[PDB]
Design an enzyme around this catalytic site. Sequence first.
Site, PDB file in Angstrom:
ATOM      1  N   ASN A  85       1.772   2.191   2.619  1.00  0.00           N
ATOM      2  CA  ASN A  85       0.491   2.590   3.188  1.00  0.00           C
ATOM      3  C   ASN A  85       0.360   2.099   4.629  1.00  0.00           C
ATOM      4  O   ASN A  85       0.928   1.064   5.005  1.00  0.00           O
ATOM      5  CB  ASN A  85      -0.670   2.077   2.344  1.00  0.00           C
ATOM      6  CG  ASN A  85      -2.000   2.598   2.841  1.00  0.00           C
ATOM      7  OD1 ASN A  85      -2.916   1.834   3.120  1.00  0.00           O
ATOM      8  ND2 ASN A  85      -2.100   3.903   2.974  1.00  0.00           N
TER       9      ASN A  85
ATOM     10  N   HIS B   4      -2.313   1.056   7.567  1.00  0.00           N
ATOM     11  CA  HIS B   4      -3.659   0.576   7.691  1.00  0.00           C
ATOM     12  C   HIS B   4      -4.163   0.571   9.113  1.00  0.00           C
ATOM     13  O   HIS B   4      -3.522   0.031  10.006  1.00  0.00           O
ATOM     14  CB  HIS B   4      -3.746  -0.822   7.129  1.00  0.00           C
ATOM     15  CG  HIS B   4      -5.121  -1.184   6.702  1.00  0.00           C
ATOM     16  ND1 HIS B   4      -5.828  -0.428   5.794  1.00  0.00           N
ATOM     17  CD2 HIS B   4      -5.957  -2.162   7.119  1.00  0.00           C
ATOM     18  CE1 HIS B   4      -7.045  -0.924   5.671  1.00  0.00           C
ATOM     19  NE2 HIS B   4      -7.150  -1.976   6.464  1.00  0.00           N
TER      20      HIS B   4
ATOM     21  N   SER C 206      -1.028  -1.749  10.708  1.00  0.00           N
ATOM     22  CA  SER C 206      -0.037  -2.420   9.882  1.00  0.00           C
ATOM     23  C   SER C 206       0.344  -1.511   8.726  1.00  0.00           C
ATOM     24  O   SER C 206      -0.501  -0.778   8.194  1.00  0.00           O
ATOM     25  CB  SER C 206      -0.611  -3.723   9.308  1.00  0.00           C
ATOM     26  OG  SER C 206      -1.786  -3.470   8.543  1.00  0.00           O
TER      27      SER C 206
ATOM     28  N   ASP D  23      -4.616  -0.149  -1.850  1.00  0.00           N
ATOM     29  CA  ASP D  23      -3.545   0.084  -0.871  1.00  0.00           C
ATOM     30  C   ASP D  23      -3.050  -1.197  -0.188  1.00  0.00           C
ATOM     31  O   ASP D  23      -2.343  -1.141   0.826  1.00  0.00           O
ATOM     32  CB  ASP D  23      -4.001   1.090   0.195  1.00  0.00           C
ATOM     33  CG  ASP D  23      -4.391   2.451  -0.399  1.00  0.00           C
ATOM     34  OD1 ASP D  23      -3.997   2.748  -1.550  1.00  0.00           O
ATOM     35  OD2 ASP D  23      -5.091   3.231   0.294  1.00  0.00           O
TER      36      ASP D  23
END
Length: 188
Positions: free
Chosen positions: A106, A108, A114, A123
């Site tokens: 995932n 972010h 990140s 997530d």
Amino acid sequence: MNIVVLISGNGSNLQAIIDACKTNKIKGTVRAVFSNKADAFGLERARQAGIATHTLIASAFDSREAYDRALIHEIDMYAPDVVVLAGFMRILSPAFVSHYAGRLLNIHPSHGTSVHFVTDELDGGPVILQAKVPVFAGDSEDDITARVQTQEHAIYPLVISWFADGRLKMHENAAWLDGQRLPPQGYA
């Protein structure tokens, strides 16, 4: 290396991944794109690139359980070595998280970005790589995003390329690059 991307919206991260693959910067192929939002623009980017797409709408199923089972069954038809979440807004079931453990990523939007290995339903999990975006007096919130978005299009394909290469793994709820266990802040 089969890659399956999950989206809910525009798909600009998905596009950066498609491009990195097309130039072989990522030693892999995006085999399918799944959306939980009807007509998300990302479905169009996928169609334009000749990639299969599937949309699963929550209101179309009896329950969260039925939905999650159908999503997993469909994704699995594509034998993904990596499932990447790129703007997928659905809260995952522990069963989904468990099923793709060690191969679920995932990105972010948090100023910085990140990418993590997903080990929980929101997530979250160990950080693989993150970058910071600087702000300046005069910066418009839409100037910040653009910078952040540009940053995401750069690091997500990079991290995915490490995975596609066999260089990146997840063990003990931690990320390991080239056999070195990365620190909580990711690769530095």
